[PDB]
Every structure is written in structure tokens, then in C-alpha cells.
Amino acid sequence: EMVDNLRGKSGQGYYVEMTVGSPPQTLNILVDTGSSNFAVGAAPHPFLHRYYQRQLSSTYRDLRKGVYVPYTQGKWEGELGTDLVSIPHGPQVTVRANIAAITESDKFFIQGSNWEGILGLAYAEIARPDDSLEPFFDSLVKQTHVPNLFSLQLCGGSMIIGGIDHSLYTGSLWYTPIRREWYYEVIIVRVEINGQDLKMDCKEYNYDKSIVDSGTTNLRLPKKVFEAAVKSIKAASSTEKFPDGFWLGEQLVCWQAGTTPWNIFPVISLYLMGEVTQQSFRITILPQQYLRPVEDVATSQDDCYKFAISQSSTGTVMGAVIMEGFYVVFDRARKRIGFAVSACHVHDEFRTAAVEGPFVTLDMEDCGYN
Ligand SMILES: CCCOc1cc(C(=O)N[C@@H](Cc2ccccc2)[C@H](O)CN[C@@H](C)C(=O)NC2CCCCC2)cc(N2C=CCC2=O)c1
Known part of the structure; x- marks a missing residue:
């Protein structure tokens, strides 16, 4: 119910x-x-x-x-x-x-x-x-x-209070620790664009903190990470050029209805700390997630979007555009957040958003900023 x-x-x-x-x-x-x-x-x-x-x-x-x-x-x-x-x-x-x-x-x-x-x-x-x-x-x-747990499937969508609803996800649930109980703070250990490592000291990904936040729209990234991500996304999509204002999340980009070039935009992989030493898993974000549709009858001859990745001075915020397409379990009782692929997914015929692992890392650095 x-x-x-x-x-x-x-x-x-x-x-x-x-x-x-x-x-x-x-x-x-x-x-x-x-x-x-x-x-x-x-x-x-x-x-x-x-x-x-x-x-x-x-x-x-x-x-x-x-x-x-x-x-x-x-x-x-x-x-x-x-x-x-x-x-x-x-x-x-x-x-x-x-x-x-x-x-x-x-x-x-x-x-x-x-x-x-x-x-x-x-x-x-x-x-x-x-x-x-x-x-x-x-x-x-x-x-x-x-029970001391709730889960969110943002699509409408579902908030399941006190438990997990299997009908709302497919595949496996992967858990990342809640690092500290204030925000729902987590640790990102690696970021890839189109499979390519941003090659950054991993503390940068969590500079200040990283949180899971259903009340924020965008994926918000620390300035250094944001600048590096935009550079990589630009490079991947370079067959088309957009105004700086688009990348600043200010102005819309529009295409004739139905013609959005999804394929020229890369997938983003965020690797989250696992529950075991030096183990991680990744969630993968399609452009259908990070290019946010803006409904406006006035522009409706086109499909128009805002770039929903933006800069932060207060750490990473994994906002709604990231949570959509995933089933996210806020397991307070066990101090962890689970991710699984949502039953309401937006994938085209070529690429599918994923939650998958395990991955191992040799570098022993703790990625928490502190
Ligand atoms: C529902 C989405 C609304 O759109 C939005 C909303 C917000 C935003 O600030 N959301 C609020 C709630 C809200 C919901 C609805 C309307 C306003 C605020 C959320 O609580 C943010 N969480 C953290 C980051 C925070 O600031 N916590 C506070 C710390 C101090 C004590 C109080 C909590 C940012 C946003 N941004 C800004 C830049 C990019 C982006 O997506 C777009």
C-alpha cells in the first residue's frame, strides 16, 4: 500500500x-x-x-x-x-x-x-x-x-517505510557505509567518465563531505572535481559544441523533438566504498539522468534540457537526478546505504544504468576528507 x-x-x-x-x-x-x-x-x-x-x-x-x-x-x-x-x-x-x-x-x-x-x-x-x-x-x-530503515524509489515513485520492497528493484543490492550519522554521508573512491579515470586523489571526491540528498536536484561536485568532469564530458561530446552557459547549468540545450543525441554523451561511474576493506562497487549514470528535461509548452517543438551536474563548495551532493533509476535503501539500523537498479529505469537500447561490483583498489589511502 x-x-x-x-x-x-x-x-x-x-x-x-x-x-x-x-x-x-x-x-x-x-x-x-x-x-x-x-x-x-x-x-x-x-x-x-x-x-x-x-x-x-x-x-x-x-x-x-x-x-x-x-x-x-x-x-x-x-x-x-x-x-x-x-x-x-x-x-x-x-x-x-x-x-x-x-x-x-x-x-x-x-x-x-x-x-x-x-x-x-x-x-x-x-x-x-x-x-x-x-x-x-x-x-x-x-x-x-x-523498523529503523526506509527506502526510496524516485521515478512519482515510492517511499517504503520500515522495509525493502523487492518489486521495486532488479539485481543485487550493494551497500556503502554511512560514514557519520548527520547527513547521510558516504565515501566516493573513484570517478570515471566513459570508463576513463578522472585520476584525482580520492579525498578530492569527498572534499568536505559526500552526501545522498533527495532534496537537491543536481549531482553537485567539489569545484576541482566538477571542472575535471566537465572537461571529460566536453571531450566525449565534442562532435557538438555548446555554450559555456550550458555547462554552467544556466541555459538550456534543445534538439528537435525526439532527436536528442544521447549517444554522444558519456556514462558517469561513481565508485562507492564497500563494506569490506578496499572493496568498492559502482553506480553508473546515463545522460538521460544528468541532462534534466525542462517541460515548457513554449519550447515544445523541441526537447530541451539543463545540465544537472554543477559545482559545490560544500562537498558532493548526490541529488535526485542521481537517485532516479536506483532503489536506495537508507539502512539506519546497520549504518549503511544500499543501491540497486530500480524497476523504473530509463535506459535506451544500447546502455543501461547499473549497480555492480566488486572492485578492488591497491592504493590504501582513506578517501574520507575528515
Ligand atoms: C526538491 C528540489 C528543489 O531544488 C533544489 C533544492 C536544493 C536544496 O537546497 N534542497 C534542500 C531542501 C529543499 C527542498 C525544496 C526547496 C528548497 C530546499 C536540501 O535540504 C539540501 N540539503 C543539504 C545540501 C543542505 O543544505 N542541508 C541543510 C544544512 C543546514 C541545516 C538545514 C539542512 C538545492 C538545489 N540545487 C542548488 C544548486 C544545484 C541544485 O540542484 C535545487
Whole structure:
């Protein structure tokens, strides 16, 4: 009953239906593994179809404390409280959870996204105001019999709470350790483009950190890695030349509908640390993943895309365009993240996104930045 309980797209977010308060108020909530605050619009906003009305809830409790949360994109401020929360198409439980009632925001809510709040699924260590504010999933596990694990299949899609759904993936699940429990932090040990090693000290791939983040759209790479990746992708696709603004993820590239030259763009392989010493596995990303379709009726004589790999100063972010096509298991109980090929895959007749291994490495360097 949890299958297909997500709607949305990489550019605007994937969301699940939830209820808050007594009696239940229904809201669509973006699923975000890149933060740890549960927050909902709680006052009118031009882009909100509905919002949390605290005065209508008999179970609302004000915590008499404000909270401010800045993201890479957008920020909001609100008032902390607790109330009853349920997930109509998830586990049939009700939990009392912390909720930030958003009273002001900037560039956070997205016009037409159809969601009104955000569910931070990461760990308390990055919750605001601080780690004393128990995140929703922690409350869910404490208050119910739900196993300490969830999985995401972003396509709509599915959030499976408390378990793994075999119908949602094919082949084997490969696991990489969660290096530290704050973000879902992982370690990348190698990057290839078209099979060619970027040939970089592997700490560079994780400079600062690397995280798995359903709330970010792009694959975001540390500047040094980003520049090297663009150089390699340019070289592979050199039979066509694009403006610098395309590679900067600013402007669209368009082709006559149906004629997108997928074959001239390379596959990207990200090798993740395995659960055994010096062992790794790789996930492979097709251009159908990293060239993000931009729907616009005005341009619809063409298919147009944005380059969805971009620069970061805060480490690697494996965003939604990376997670799409994979089934991703956030195995909190065992401190690991699993990857498998998703049942909803976009591969043409020549290449297929993959999760595969094992691979071994001779260089004993720890790739974590620290
Ligand atoms: C759903 C996709 C929306 O599009 C987007 C969204 C974001 C973005 O900032 N997403 C937020 C949530 C959001 C969801 C929806 C709207 C706004 C924010 C997510 O939490 C980001 N996670 C990490 C990186 C983070 O910044 N954590 C915070 C640390 C401090 C404490 C609070 C958590 C970046 C983005 N970017 C920016 C550059 C390239 C890219 O893809 C495109």
C-alpha cells in the first residue's frame, strides 16, 4: 500500500501525503534526506494552496521557541511545536512529532510544486536549532514498531517505510557505509567518465563531505572535481559544441523533438566504498539522468534540457537526478546505504544504468576528507 505513494520530479521535489493535527489536516510533504527538520507552511503564501492551521488542532503544543533553516536553495523561519502526524499511504501509525510552523520564507516554496512542507529524514546532528530537536523518523521509530530503515524509489515513485520492497528493484543490492550519522554521508573512491579515470586523489571526491540528498536536484561536485568532469564530458561530446552557459547549468540545450543525441554523451561511474576493506562497487549514470528535461509548452517543438551536474563548495551532493533509476535503501539500523537498479529505469537500447561490483583498489589511502 506504500508503493507509488510519491509524486513529483527532480526539479521541484518528490512528496508524500501526510496529515498533521487533530482532526487531521492533509498536506503534501517533500521527502528530503538532506536535512532533518520537519516543517510545514503555516501561514498564507502566494505559492501555497493550503497550510497548517494550528488553531484548528486540539493536539498542537507550542514549544515557545523559534527556528531558522537555511538550505542551499531557499530558507525559512518558523515556530516550533509538536502535534500528531500520520502518513495515509505509509505505516498505519500516528506519532507525536516536532513540527516547525513556517511563518516566513524566501525562495523556498516553489510555484506549482504541489507540496506545502518538507520532511527532513537525516539525523539530529544537523537539525536546527540544534541536535536536541528529535527528527520525525526518530520519533516514528521510538513510538511505533516500525523498523529503523526506509527506502526510496524516485521515478512519482515510492517511499517504503520500515522495509525493502523487492518489486521495486532488479539485481543485487550493494551497500556503502554511512560514514557519520548527520547527513547521510558516504565515501566516493573513484570517478570515471566513459570508463576513463578522472585520476584525482580520492579525498578530492569527498572534499568536505559526500552526501545522498533527495532534496537537491543536481549531482553537485567539489569545484576541482566538477571542472575535471566537465572537461571529460566536453571531450566525449565534442562532435557538438555548446555554450559555456550550458555547462554552467544556466541555459538550456534543445534538439528537435525526439532527436536528442544521447549517444554522444558519456556514462558517469561513481565508485562507492564497500563494506569490506578496499572493496568498492559502482553506480553508473546515463545522460538521460544528468541532462534534466525542462517541460515548457513554449519550447515544445523541441526537447530541451539543463545540465544537472554543477559545482559545490560544500562537498558532493548526490541529488535526485542521481537517485532516479536506483532503489536506495537508507539502512539506519546497520549504518549503511544500499543501491540497486530500480524497476523504473530509463535506459535506451544500447546502455543501461547499473549497480555492480566488486572492485578492488591497491592504493590504501582513506578517501574520507575528515
Ligand atoms: C526538491 C528540489 C528543489 O531544488 C533544489 C533544492 C536544493 C536544496 O537546497 N534542497 C534542500 C531542501 C529543499 C527542498 C525544496 C526547496 C528548497 C530546499 C536540501 O535540504 C539540501 N540539503 C543539504 C545540501 C543542505 O543544505 N542541508 C541543510 C544544512 C543546514 C541545516 C538545514 C539542512 C538545492 C538545489 N540545487 C542548488 C544548486 C544545484 C541544485 O540542484 C535545487
